[PDB]
UniProtKB/Swiss-Prot annotation, chain B:
Protein name: Fatty acid synthase subunit beta
Family, similarity comment: Belongs to the fungal fatty acid synthetase subunit beta family.
Superkingdom field: Eukaryota
Leader sequence segment: none
Shown residues within the full chain: 899 to 1026 of 2051
Subunit-level organization: [Alpha(6)beta(6)] hexamers of two multifunctional subunits (alpha and beta).
Role description: Fatty acid synthetase catalyzes the formation of long-chain fatty acids from acetyl-CoA, malonyl-CoA and NADPH. The beta subunit contains domains for: [acyl-carrier-protein] acetyltransferase and malonyltransferase, S-acyl fatty acid synthase thioesterase, enoyl-[acyl-carrier-protein] reductase, and 3-hydroxypalmitoyl-[acyl-carrier-protein] dehydratase.
Other known facts: Present with 91800 molecules/cell in log phase SD medium.
Native source organism of the sequence: Saccharomyces cerevisiae (strain ATCC 204508 / S288c) (Baker's yeast)
Curated annotation (Swiss-Prot), chain D:
Disulfide bonds: none
Ranges for domain Ketosynthase family 3 (KS3): 252-581
Organism of provenance: Saccharomyces cerevisiae (strain ATCC 204508 / S288c)
Other information: Present with 17000 molecules/cell in log phase SD medium.
Residues represented out of the complete protein: 872 to 1452 of 1887
Top-rank lineage group of the source organism: Eukaryota
Record's protein name: Fatty acid synthase subunit alpha
Modified residues (Phosphoserine): S87, S569
Protein family per UniProt: Belongs to the thiolase-like superfamily. Fungal fatty acid synthetase subunit alpha family.
Post-translational events: 4'-phosphopantetheine is transferred from CoA to a specific serine of the Acyl carrier domain by the C-terminal PPT domain. This modification is essential for activity because fatty acids are bound in thioester linkage to the sulfhydryl of the prosthetic group.
Primary role: Fatty acid synthetase catalyzes the formation of long-chain fatty acids from acetyl-CoA, malonyl-CoA and NADPH. The alpha subunit contains domains for: acyl carrier protein, 3-oxoacyl-[acyl-carrier-protein] reductase, and 3-oxoacyl-[acyl-carrier-protein] synthase. This subunit coordinates the binding of the six beta subunits to the enzyme complex.
Active-site positions on this chain: C434 (for beta-ketoacyl synthase activity)
Subunit structure: [Alpha(6)beta(6)] hexamers of two multifunctional subunits (alpha and beta).
Length: 145, 128, 177, 581, 242
């Protein structure tokens, strides 16, 4: 599962590498649009090796409800409309840039950013631990990076 | 008459519409550039012929480029300037004049700030 | 900011590598034939790796047919494609039933800041002198620097393609260095 | 990590920080570093105990990194600013000493391109090159009166002409020529030749403001407008007589519970109200005027309008601004014929221009008037005239008396013969629904190979209207546009053939025409030849109860007996066939 | 002569049950089944149609023993235009002629992800981006209408015709064509700027007195009227000995 892997980011190059080596990846976008789904289609068609599979979902890592829903979607069975996956890695690289906000300026944007970059990363890990423990998966841990 | 039919290639009566861009620029030189004196009869006639060679480049170029005729001075050796223009743009040797370029040519033939051209370019209401 | 975006219905699934393999080959095959890619360009090796990582029987037949039916007498480009074509089929037969690999063969770049005589600041990425592969990049990393102290590519791609399936036996590790 | 170029992530000082024998990273290197942590060795390690990896490149051993990077920026900025101030002062000195007389010799005249729209005729090779591709035995083997060629084609559709559609199909972007043609079609630019706000101007002008427009500027001024108002896009009501699929007018029958207020109406209209309702109305003359008063009693039947919200909101419509007048179809024709006929009339002249035949009568220097056929056809025909005769006539709106004849599928081919061709050729109008255009070629081929004609117009046309949209939606043939928006799909990306998530077709409108001839006559007349029609078959399928189910009947075009194939038939070998000739 | 050329050049396969109508069609010009490069599929973006069509083309190619590893390159032009019903095949046919004469094969840019079901059809390839080939020799065009209408046209590259005439007849042709391309360009640009590409005829090429005479004479042809400059039938050239 990779967050923050938009175009011209470290995440995008990680993603090419994962597909190149046959990974099944869920990449999340914060700007879901035709320009984005065209981007990712062109990546997969260039790089996606045999047995690879890129799923691209809209997402707002700043939302608790999105975080729960996304992990619930990845782990729900194909019968219920999920992927019926079981994560081996999570690479939560989703950020928003804060510039020239020194201590006196910390306001809404910084408290929101803190939710994306910390609080909701703990909630993704929480959700992944609840889904794996629901199904009694004790020997296939997800490497958080 | 002293003002001949302009669109006459090798003595074959024709029409501006059914002349090539090469044929039009060679005919301008034939009618507006005196071989004995080896110069343009009027500077405004040279300007009329340069304008037309620029218009050729505009029609047959694919991208923004520098003109091959930077000063109309270069037309004081007209045969060279014509060969230089139609070698860059050899399509223009074969294509007939665009209808936009006919209209432009007949509109330069009516410029009040130039010596009247020494030829009838078209039979219409303005023939008199 | 906390407005939901996610919905299972907007999930887009890309999984048809079987079909994009053939397109990747055919794009390369006609790129080479029209001299868009030459025998020196790294892009020829990158595209090979990606074709090898999608190798199956249906792709090996697709390559065998197109390369066999190429007439090398029509042009130098047609000979270059046919030589590389044969090489790529040899690789794609070898790596059938082998796991696909991540292998970056892009030329490693370093920063260059240049100020001109008119004081315009331009930043480019230029190729490093010492490091022209990732193998060498990992060697440069293992050697550190003075501050960290405490108390076949670019010349012929067709031969560099023939070396892709061969898992190079590491004599002595970079960790020893 | 270094972002893209210049400003991002302080790239300008990266070379500077690297001069301490610290390393900075490309994204591709930092990606490779991080995938190092998904290798099985480091994964196995992560599972023993948590793994902290430093991919910092020694940047931790630089003391006061804030101060050190601020110093590097300030040592670049001072050096850039100095040289800028010295460059500004040598440019001013040079200005003063040389004025603008020795500075005017440097400036050169640029040539801005003008659209030069070619007709893209086929490139004929030298005979040596075109003798290579065919075997030598071919020469004098074929009867060229039995070889059908396509000599010209055109279409009116969602992306305008065949030239413009082809640009957007092959390259997904307009050329200069493509923009100008799409701007002219859509009516953004008209041509002007004359005096325009005094001085004389010969060229394109904005069709609204009459402001001059250069060819270079047409991409800058109108491409966004052209791309917005072409192709598969939200149904524009202005193009469909105010049809809005979000507000689709139906009428419910209601019984009057208590009497209405009397309204005024003419004698004839009141007698009509009386005839219909019988006892349930009262008509009374008003002696002052002679105009009657209609009074609907209790138990009378009325019709109250109600709007339905429909879920097909997107179609392949012809670019907004497209107008038959732009091609020069007179208002007397536009007011008479169905809108579909206007697409055919334009497609037919535009095909004749593609075939190098500007005056169709030229054909009759080479062939009899009985030898030019029209083998073209439609699926549903003039569906605006059907609406007219079934709905608008019911609602006693004003409709042309001859609306019936405009409705008929064979009436587009009538107008073509009546306005342009004036042949007495065969006229075989097929109706094949979505296979009408391939049936047209099948009939037009069979017509030439039979001697009944030597040229045929072929092809197909169909319009998009309210009733057909709705009915394709009740048959669930078309894509539900609400479901597409649920899945985050924009209009453009709703027609996605061969994909996992395809869910019905996108309705469109327009016409396509080809001109086909015998090859023998094409060579004689010297018309371009864009291809040979080698085959054209049709086929039904089998016993079933589903009319819209597609089947495998056309598989019969590849029927051959393979019991006895031990030795190749000599009849397939061209050397043999040429010998027997 | 013509009947012999027809018996051996054109219609050599009409009576032969060992040769397909689709094989004979190509074989006529010396093409084999492998030379069919591009299939312009109906490809409506419906579940039933797009599978059915792929399966149909696959089974044709397999029965006519097309080379393994040589799929037809499917072209789904309706990703861009949508489905105009009657006009569908006409648009396909125009894009087939534009594929042959350019050798560019357009890609389905909405082919996000090709249906897994279509992998079983090894004789079909579904590109998502435009290929500049060295050349396309023939193009199939398959349509499937409502009411069990199925169609197929084959269109062959027009260069396979010119190898069937003499160098003198070909060079005559090429001279005539160039003359006509120049006059057509002239007409096009003039009709574009003055909104007069379309010009309705006011009259038939014959008056009403000649109408029956022109119909009944098969060798009646038109000729420029010296006065009006228009192509008309002239009484003198109807039931003429000449």
């Amino acid at each position: 599962l990779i967050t923050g892997a938009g175009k011209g980011s470290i995440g995008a190059e990680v993603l090419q590498g994962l597909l190149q080596g046959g990974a099944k990846v869920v990449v999340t976008t914060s700007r879901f649009s035709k320009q984005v789904t065209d981007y990712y289609q062109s990546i997969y068609a260039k790089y996606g090796a045999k047995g690879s599979t890129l799923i691209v979902v809209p997402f707002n890592q700043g939302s608790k409800q999105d975080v729960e829903a996304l992990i619930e979607f990845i782990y729900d069975t194909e019968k219920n409309g999920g992927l019926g996956w079981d994560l081996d890695a999570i690479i939560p690289f989703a950020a928003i840039p804060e510039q020239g906000i020194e201590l006196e300026h910390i306001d809404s944007k910084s408290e929101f950013a803190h939710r994306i970059m910390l609080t909701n990363i703990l909630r993704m890990m929480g959700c992944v631990k609840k889904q794996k423990s629901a199904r009694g998966i004790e020997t296939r841990p997800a490497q958080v990076i | 008459f002293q003002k001949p039919w302009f669109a006459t290639v090798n003595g074959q009566a024709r029409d501006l519409a059914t002349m090539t861009y090469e044929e039009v620029a060679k005919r301008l030189v034939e009618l507006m550039f005196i071989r004995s004196t080896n110069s343009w009869f009027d500077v405004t006639w040279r300007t009329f012929t340069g304008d037309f060679l620029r218009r050729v480049e505009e029609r047959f170029t694919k991208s923004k480029t520098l003109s091959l005729i930077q000063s109309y001075s270069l037309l004081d050796k007209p045969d060279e300037a014509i060969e230089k223009v139609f070698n860059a743009y050899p399509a223009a040797r074969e294509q007939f004049l665009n209808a936009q370029d006919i209209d432009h040519f007949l509109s330069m033939c009516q410029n009040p700030m130039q010596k009247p051209v020494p030829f009838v370019p078209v039979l219409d209401r303005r023939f008199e | 900011g906390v407005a939901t975006s996610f919905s299972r219905k907007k999930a887009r699934t890309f999984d048809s590598s079987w079909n994009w393999a053939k397109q990747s080959l055919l794009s390369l095959y006609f790129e080479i034939i029209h001299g868009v890619l030459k025998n020196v360009d790294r892009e020829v090796v990158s595209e090979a790796i990606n074709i090898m990582n999608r190798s199956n029987d249906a792709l090996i037949k697709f390559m065998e047919y197109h390369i066999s039916n190429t007439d090398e007498t029509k042009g130098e480009n047609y000979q270059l494609v046919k030589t590389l074509g044969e090489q790529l089929i040899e690789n794609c037969k070898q790596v059938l039933d082998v796991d696909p690999v991540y292998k970056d063969v892009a030329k490693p770049t370093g920063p260059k800041t240049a100020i001109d005589k008119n004081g315009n600041i331009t930043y480019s990425e230029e190729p490093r002198e010492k490091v022209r592969k990732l193998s060498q990049y990992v060697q440069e990393m293992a050697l550190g620097g003075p501050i960290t102290k405490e108390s076949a590519l670019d010349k012929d791609s067709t031969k560099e393609v023939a070396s892709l399936p061969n898992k190079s036996t590491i004599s002595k590790t970079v960790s020893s260095t | 990590t270094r972002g893209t170029g210049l400003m991002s992530a302080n790239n300008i000082i990266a070379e500077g920080i690297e001069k301490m024998g610290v390393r900075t990273f490309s994204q591709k290197e930092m990606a490779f570093n991080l995938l190092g942590l998904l290798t099985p060795e480091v994964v196995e390690l992560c599972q023993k105990s948590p793994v902290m990896a430093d991919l910092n490149g020694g940047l931790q051993f630089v003391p006061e990194l804030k101060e050190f990077t601020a110093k590097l920026r300030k040592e670049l900025v001072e050096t850039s600013e100095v040289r800028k101030a010295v460059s500004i002062e040598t440019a001013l000195e040079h200005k003063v000493v040389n004025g603008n007389s020795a500075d005017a010799a440097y400036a050169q005249v640029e040539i801005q391109p003008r659209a030069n729209i070619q007709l893209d005729f086929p490139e004929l090779k030298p005979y040596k090159q075109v003798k290579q591709i065919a075997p030598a035995e071919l020469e004098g083997l074929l009867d060229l009166e039995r070889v059908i060629v396509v000599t010209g084609f055109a279409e009116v559709g969602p992306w305008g002409s065949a030239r413009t559609r082809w640009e957007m199909e092959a390259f997904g972007e307009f050329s200069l020529e493509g923009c100008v043609e799409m701007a002219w079609i859509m009516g953004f630019i008209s041509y002007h030749n004359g005096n325009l706000k005094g001085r004389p101007y010969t060229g394109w002008v904005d069709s609204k403001t009459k402001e001059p427009v250069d060819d270079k500027d047409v991409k800058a001024k109108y491409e966004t407008s052209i791309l917005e108002h072409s192709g598969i896009r939200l149904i524009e009501p202005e193009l469909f007589n105010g049809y809005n699929p979000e507000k689709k007018e139906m009428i419910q029958e209601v019984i009057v519970e208590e009497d209405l207020e009397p309204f005024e109406a003419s004698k004839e209209t009141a007698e009509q109200f009386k005839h219909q309702h019988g006892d349930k109305v009262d008509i009374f003359e008003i002696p002052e005027t002679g105009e009657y008063s209609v009074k609907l009693l209790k138990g009378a039947t009325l019709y109250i309008p109600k709007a339905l919200r429909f879920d097909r909101l997107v179609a392949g419509q012809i670019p907004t601004g497209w107008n038959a007048k732009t091609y020069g179809i007179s208002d007397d024709i536009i007011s008479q014929v169905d809108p579909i006929t206007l697409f055919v009339l334009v497609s037919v002249v535009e095909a004749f221009i593609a075939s190098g035949i500007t005056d169709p009568y030229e054909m009759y220097k080479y062939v009899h008037v009985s030898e030019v056929g029209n083998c073209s056809g439609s699926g549903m025909g003039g569906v605006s005239a059907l609406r007219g005769m079934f709905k608008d006539r019911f609602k006693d709106e004003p409709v042309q008396n001859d609306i019936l004849q405009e409705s008929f599928i064979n009436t587009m081919s009538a107008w073509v013969n009546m306005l342009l061709i004036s042949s007495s050729g065969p006229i075989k109008t097929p109706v094949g629904a979505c296979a009408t255009s391939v049936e047209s070629v099948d009939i037009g081929v069979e017509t030439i190979l039979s001697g009944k004609a030597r040229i045929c117009i072929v092809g197909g046309y169909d319009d998009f209207q309210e009733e057909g949209s709705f009915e394709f939606g009740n048959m669930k043939a078309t894509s539900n546009t609400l479901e597409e928006f649920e899945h985050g799909r924009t209009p453009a990306e709703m027609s996605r053939p061969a994909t996992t998530t395809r869910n019905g077709f996108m309705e469109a409108q327009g016409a396509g025409i080809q001109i086909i001839m015998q090859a023998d006559l094409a060579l004689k007349m010297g018309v371009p030849i864009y291809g040979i029609v080698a085959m054209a078959a049709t086929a039904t399928d089998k016993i079933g109860r589903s009319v819209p189910a597609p089947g495998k009947g056309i598989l019969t075009t590849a029927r051959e007996h393979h019991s006895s194939v031990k030795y190749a038939s000599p009849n397939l070998n061209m050397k043999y066939r040429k010998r027997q000739l | 002569l013509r009947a012999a050329q027809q018996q051996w050049g054109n219609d050599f396969y009409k009576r032969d049950p060992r040769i397909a109508p689709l094989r004979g069609a190509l074989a006529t010009y010396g093409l084999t089944i492998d030379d069919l490069g591009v299939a312009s599929f109906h490809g409506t973006s419906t579940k039933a149609n797009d599978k059915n069509e792929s399966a149909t083309i696959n089974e044709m190619m397999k029965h006519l023993g097309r080379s393994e590893g040589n799929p037809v390159i499917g072209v789904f032009q309706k990703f861009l235009t949508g489905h105009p019903k009657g006009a569908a095949g006409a648009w396909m046919m125009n894009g087939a002629l534009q594929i042959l004469n350019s050798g560019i094969i357009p890609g389905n840019r909405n082919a996000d992800n090709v249906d897994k079901i279509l992998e079983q059809f090894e004789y079909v390839l579904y590109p998502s981006k435009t290929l500049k080939t060295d050349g396309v020799r023939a193009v199939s065009i398959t349509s499937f209408g409502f009411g069990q209408k199925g169609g197929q046209a084959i269109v062959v590259h027009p260069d396979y015709l010119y190898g069937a005439i003499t160098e003198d007849r070909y060079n005559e042709y090429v001279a005539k064509v160039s003359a006509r391309e120049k006059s057509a360009y002239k007409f096009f640009h003039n009709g574009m700027i003055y909104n007069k590409l379309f010009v309705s005829k006011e009259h038939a090429p014959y008056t009403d007195e000649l109408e029956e005479d022109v119909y009944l004479d098969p060798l009646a042809r038109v000729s420029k009227d010296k006065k009006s400059g228009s192509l008309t039938f002239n009484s003198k050239n109807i039931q003429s000995k000449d």
